[PDB]
Design a binder for this molecule. Structure first.
Ligand SMILES: [Zn+2]
Lengths: 139, 144, 101, 72, 189, 66, 143, 57, 54, 56
RNA sequence: AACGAGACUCUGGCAUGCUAACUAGUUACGCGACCGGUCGGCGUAACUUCUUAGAGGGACAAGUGGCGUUCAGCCACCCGAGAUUGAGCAAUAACAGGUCUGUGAUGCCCUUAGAUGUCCGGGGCUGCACGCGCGCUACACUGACUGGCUCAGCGUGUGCCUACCCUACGCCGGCAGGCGCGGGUAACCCGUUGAACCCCAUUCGUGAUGGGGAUCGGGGAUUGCAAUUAUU
């Protein structure tokens, strides 16, 4: 009667809890509007401004999140909201509604279901970072 | 209509709590308020001459979100970036008496007490008025 | 006796895993409540040195590593039996530290 | 050339501030400083009384940007 | 259904040129709520044609060294510019963006051939993807260069060139470079 | 690019020549039989032999190979 | 925030031609011995708002901010603000202002030049005093 | 007093490095090969390898 | 010459530590309690167990 | 030359799949050359160097 | 046929599948607190999604379509976590490359008792008319300041000789610090590592300005046996 999925960017892991509820989506115990980078409030609200409030009216989402930064935790929250609603519709609704959710979520942006797998390369001696090298001189 | 501190943006909640603490009167404001910098990295004294009320508000709110903190954790909360000369910048801590004369100022309104684990946390009587003013700030933004 | 805790450490992993599997097998055959082999995180010991002995060429560094792997297995068993099955798993490289509650 | 501006209100420029500033369709602290030849703090603060006058609409308020338009 | 910054819609935006239709994004399904997308557009050649050109302008806004990572800084610069554009013109502020990208990119460049110090160039065509790439570069460096030591902010200085490139004026820095990049191009031909 | 060295091609040629009855067109059942016939040091070579075998079994239907 | 009329455009305090149209806290900075930090403390001790500029100040509040620069220790300004805390001659706590800063540090320097010390001689040759390296830097203005 | 786990495995190494280098310097002209240190709870056993052991004891 | 020669306080500093096999004082690895030279560590590294992986 | 050949023929008779003996120094004269006494197979690169080839 | 290339080894990415977790937890149940909400607040149980780390999977140019003497292979696309992750190791043959200042590696020579040994004390290695290199901070409005808000990952930590630490918390101090008082040989404590740009508000207003901080005059405090040629 409950779902637990994880969303993921560079280091962040937002883990969404979906049980049968009314529609209070909470990040770490606070609303989606009050989440502090409000420049990306629409980035947070994409999976509910896409599929409407009525497809979320039966669930209740308490998202916890830790790791990464601010932008990387926004892209982890919205991935776990999508991956939680899809798993709820697969586990307690039919496959057809899961398909009709998944095609709109994929059609907007595939990074609402598939993790972004790129991480930071390692620094090497000889330069300041992974690819860049120290300045050299002549004679 | 169950309002808690987390159901409102904190940047106005701190202003509301500072206005409530200022209007109470019985907050033990120290003697060196109009002379000090709040850390060793800030190059000027703060602009608002009532800075002690805003600081004593936000220390209490960080005791709402996680208690068990003391003057050492409050030094790490209110720490910033020290721009130092032609050497690169580094994170410097805050003060340990500006962050200590707020903590036993909140004891002056019996809003906090020293917990058994060592730091300081909120009393239930001090958890009353924080939620009261959270309701008072969540009830004055949607109607106007 | 509650909380007989066996601490197992080695630099390689296959021998440590072999000893840990033999210990939990030899404890489970005597019908004891055996908690699983928990795995504390792996610490890596890095030391990076210049390759050169003198200090001349093209600034080539080395990257040495020693990795230390650590397990615990916990037993709710009396003390007069536990000192038998650990004394027979004589394998090199793996170090045993037994503590009682 | 260097910019000589005025830190406080002038008698003549206060007439310029009160009648065509509600007739611009874009009022912003870096156009008022350029047109009426004032400093930025008069543009930042003297405009914020016109919101209380009810003569100028407020579009967007930000740290680094303030956008005012006229009503109707 | 999808409005950029929740307010500006895309259905009435009309690209003029056929040369830039397949390359300039949103009209239909590149409609996004925000320019921030964080997508792997540089993973292959020609893949960045399928990215929304609002994100193109945002990404080229942060060019100089003290602003090189700041994306949340430049997206609010573009958002605040899309208010000043709408105030100073009165229409949808995305049609003026494609009017500026259509107008600003050159259509005949000169390719450099010579020896060490000797320059004898020759005129060639311009691919329309390089036209889109060099449209946004001239726009963004015009906004950057005319806001440097000036009371004007970057949001006003971007908007007052993003309309002046749509109107084809020669006070904008962008069209001042395009007509000279074609003037020295015709001079060899 | 993706060129198979003499190890993959030599091993694939002998394992076709000796065990042609078990090999078909599926790469997966080719991999499950190439790890039961041969003793390959493991997977990233095992999947390269079994892929050239799966490209080499399709080449036998269309005629002989040299 | 109306048109001012009694606008003393130049304030002649302590033999210094300070600004009159800057802010009231950063106008006092233009005298020697007052930085941006000291003027804020004397203005908060004088109980004046710092929104105002320098030209609308009534002459009571003009003189009462100069008289807290001639003797700040009566007004609870502590000793760690002062320009010379423990003086070498009288041991007195004072904030040296513009007329006597040169007239004090000259005597501090030539005090070290009568003594024939490692620092006064280093000042007398014009080289660097605080132990910097002197090979590659400081080349500007030297011949 | 005990010691850290990071120190105990590094001090274990420098034992067998000095032991081996000492036995190299000692028995290099007696065909010495290496050592093998096995630690029991009773004792610590050191097994020397050599070509002709019977001319080493 | 009794309150003298080994008199000077060598309680810290660069010349109170030396390598444990070289007895040399420069380029010293004190980390994890090695206390070897940077050159003599590289000779005995595989004996200690520090393997070069990446 | 003779002393390296004796060792090399012993350690090839004893079943090693190949060996390599190098004696560097001033074995005759004042400029110092080297030698290279090699036989059989010998792997230099990769990870099997750790367990297949035995150096000293 | 042999070596080098490739294979190989470590690492990144995937797994609601397996193995198990009071030195990691989530969910649920009571209790408590403040208004069904909020708890990083307290104890029990279902269990491993999140955390750890082991085995085993998974990707092969395997599928489709083009081009290839229809060969080796190349290009595009579906399905996919993924359709070149990043390193390590690295031949034959050489160099009048560097290293005797890493070695109790070492040949010859020099010196060996007003010593070229070695200790002690004090200086110097930093010295400045000036050339030449690696860099840090900047020249500002995409900004400086003063408040407010909210997020990491790799690590290290009480030492044979050996003196020498990570530090929570209470008090006194503007502050640098000072007193006690606890924890931690560590997934048990610092530590939910309450990082900085970033984000949100106030002030400043294109000027050598509040940008920029060099160079200097006074104090105060730690480290040390010693701080003057400024240790910080
Ligand atoms: Zn050494």
């Amino acid at each position: 009667q409950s779902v637990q999925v994880f969303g993921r960017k560079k280091t962040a892991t937002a883990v969404a809890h979906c049980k049968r509820g009314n529609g209070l989506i909470k990040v770490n115990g606070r609303p989606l509007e009050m989440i502090e980078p409000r420049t990306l409030q629409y980035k947070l609200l994409e999976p509910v401004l896409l599929l409407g409030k009525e497809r979320f009216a039966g669930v209740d989402i308490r998202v916890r999140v830790k790791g990464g930064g601010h932008v990387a935790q926004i892209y982890a929250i919205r991935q776990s909201i999508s991956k939680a609603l899809v798993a709820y519709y697969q586990k307690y609704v039919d496959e057809a509604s899961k398909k009709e959710i998944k095609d709109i979520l994929i059609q907007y942006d595939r990074t609402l279901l598939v993790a972004d797998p790129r991480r930071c390369e390692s620094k090497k001696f000889g330069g300041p970072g992974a690819r860049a090298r120290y300045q050299k001189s002549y004679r | 209509p169950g309002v808690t501190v987390k159901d409102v943006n904190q940047q106005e909640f701190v202003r509301a709590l500072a206005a409530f603490l200022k209007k109470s009167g019985k907050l033990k404001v120290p003697e060196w308020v109009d002379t000090v910098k709040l850390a060793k990295h800030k190059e000027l004294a703060p602009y608002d001459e009532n800075w002690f009320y805003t600081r004593a508000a936000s220390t209490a709110r960080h005791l709402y979100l996680r208690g068990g903190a003391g003057v050492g954790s409050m030094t790490k909360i209110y720490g910033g970036r020290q721009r130092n000369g032609v050497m690169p910048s580094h994170f410097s801590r805050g003060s340990k008496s500006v962050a200590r004369r707020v903590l036993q100022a909140l004891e002056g309104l019996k809003m906090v007490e020293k917990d058994q684990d060592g730091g300081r946390k909120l009393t239930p009587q001090g958890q009353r008025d924080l939620d009261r003013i959270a309701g008072q700030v969540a009830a004055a933004n949607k109607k106007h | 006796i509650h909380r007989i805790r066996i601490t197992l450490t080695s630099r390689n992993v296959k021998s440590l895993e072999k000893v840990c599997a033999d210990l939990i097998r030899g404890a489970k055959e005597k019908n004891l409540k055996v908690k699983g082999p928990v795995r504390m995180p792996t610490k890596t010991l890095r030391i990076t040195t210049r390759k050169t002995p003198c200090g001349e060429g093209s600034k080539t560094w080395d990257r040495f590593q020693m990795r230390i792997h650590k397990r615990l297995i916990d037993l709710h068993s009396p003390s007069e039996i536990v000192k038998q099955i650990t004394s027979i798993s004589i394998e090199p490289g793996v170090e045993v530290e037994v503590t009682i509650a | 050339d260097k910019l000589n501006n005025l830190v406080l209100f002038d008698k003549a420029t206060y007439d310029k501030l009160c009648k065509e500033v509600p007739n611009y369709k874009l009022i912003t602290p870096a156009v008022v400083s350029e047109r009426l030849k004032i400093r930025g703090s008069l543009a930042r603060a003297a405009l914020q009384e016109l919101l209380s006058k009810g003569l100028i609409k407020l579009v967007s308020k930000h740290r680094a940007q303030v956008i005012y338009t006229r009503n109707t | 259904d999808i409005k950029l910054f929740g307010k500006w819609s895309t259905d009435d935006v009309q690209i003029n040129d056929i040369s830039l239709q397949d390359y300039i994004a949103v009209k239909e399904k590149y409609a996004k709520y925000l320019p921030h997308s964080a997508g792997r557009y540089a993973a292959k050649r020609f893949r960045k044609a399928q990215c929304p050109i609002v994100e193109r302008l945002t990404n080229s806004m942060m060019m100089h060294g003290r602003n090189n990572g700041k994306k949340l800084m430049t997206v609010r610069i573009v958002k605040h510019a899309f208010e000043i554009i709408h105030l100073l013109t009165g229409e949808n502020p995305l049609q003026v963006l494609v009017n500026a990208i259509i107008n600003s990119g050159p259509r005949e460049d000169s390719t450099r051939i010579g020896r060490a110090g000797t320059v004898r160039r020759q005129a060639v065509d311009v691919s329309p993807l390089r036209r889109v790439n060099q449209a946004i570069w001239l726009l963004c460096t015009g906004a950057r260069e005319a806001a440097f030591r000036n009371i004007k902010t970057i949001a006003e200085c971007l908007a007052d060139e993003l309309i002046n490139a749509a109107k084809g004026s020669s006070n904008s820095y962008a069209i001042k470079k395009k007509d000279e990049l074609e003037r020295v191009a015709k001079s060899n031909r | 690019g993706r060129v198979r060295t003499k190890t993959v091609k030599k091993a694939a040629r002998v394992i076709i020549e000796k065990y042609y009855t078990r090999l078909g067109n599926d790469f997966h059942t080719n991999k499950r039989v190439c790890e039961e016939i041969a003793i390959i040091p493991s997977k990233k070579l095992r999947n390269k032999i079994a892929g050239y075998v799966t490209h080499l079994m399709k080449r036998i239907q269309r005629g002989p190979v040299r | 925030l109306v048109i001012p009329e009694k606008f003393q455009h130049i304030l002649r305090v302590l033999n210094t031609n300070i600004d009159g149209r800057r802010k009231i806290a950063f106008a006092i900075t233009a005298i020697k011995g007052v930085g941006r930090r000291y003027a804020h403390v004397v203005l908060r001790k004088a109980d004046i708002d710092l929104t105002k500029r320098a030209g609308e100040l009534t002459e009571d509040e003009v003189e009462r901010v100069i008289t807290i620069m001639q003797n700040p220790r009566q007004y609870k300004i502590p000793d760690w603000f002062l320009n010379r805390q423990k003086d070498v001659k009288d041991g007195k706590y004072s904030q040296v202002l513009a007329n006597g800063l040169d007239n004090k540090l000259r005597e501090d320097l030539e005090r070290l030049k009568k003594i024939r010390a490692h620092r006064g001689l280093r000042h007398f040759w014009g080289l660097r005093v605080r132990g910097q390296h002197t090979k590659t830097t400081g080349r500007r203005g030297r011949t | 007093v005990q010691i850290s786990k990071k120190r105990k495995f590094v001090a274990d190494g420098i034992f067998k490095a000095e032991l081996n280098e000492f036995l190299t310097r000692e028995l290099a002209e007696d065909g010495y090969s290496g050592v093998e240190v096995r630690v029991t709870p009773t004792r610590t056993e050191i097994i020397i390898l050599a070509t002709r052991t019977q001319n080493v004891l | 010459h009794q309150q003298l020669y080994w008199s000077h306080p060598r309680k810290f500093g660069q010349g109170s530590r030396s390598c444990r096999v070289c007895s040399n004082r420069h380029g010293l690895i004190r980390k994890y309690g090695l206390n070897m030279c940077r050159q003599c560590f590289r000779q005995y590294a595989k004996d200690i167990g520090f393997i070069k992986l990446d | 030359r003779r002393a390296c050949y004796g060792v090399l023929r012993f350690i090839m008779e004893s079943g090693a799949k190949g060996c390599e003996v190098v004696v560097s120094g001033k074995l005759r004269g004042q400029r110092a050359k080297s030698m290279k006494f090699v036989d059989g197979l010998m792997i230099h690169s990769g990870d099997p160097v750790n367990y297949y080839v035995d150096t000293a």
